[PDB]
């Protein structure tokens, strides 16, 4: 999406690949974890993401 030359249309859409997500690493037992999860689901749950 920023390529100069535009010779790059990638292999599929992630079919045969790792297929993971991105997350936030916290300490094992942090009290912030549930609140951060609810905040991320609020940020996806309104189209702001």
């Amino acid at each position: 999406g920023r390529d100069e030359g535009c010779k790059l249309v990638t292999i599929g859409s992630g079919y045969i690949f790792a297929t993971t997500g991105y997350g936030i690493a916290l300490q094992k037992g942090s009290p912030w974890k549930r609140q951060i999860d609810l905040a991320l689901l609020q940020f996806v749950g309104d189209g702001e993401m």
């Binding site: 249309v9 292999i11 992630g14 993971t20 997500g21 690493a25």
Partner: protein, 49 residues
Amino acid sequence: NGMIGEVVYQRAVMAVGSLTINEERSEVVDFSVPFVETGISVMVSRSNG
């Protein structure tokens, strides 16, 4: 090393940036919920043809 070494040795609270999800990180720290669908892919030469 890196952000994992900063969080496990507790010189930081959390890591916000792009971070993959595998077994050893879930052993040493705790991920949040995933917010973006980001797997892996392969960029090749992919000429005109």
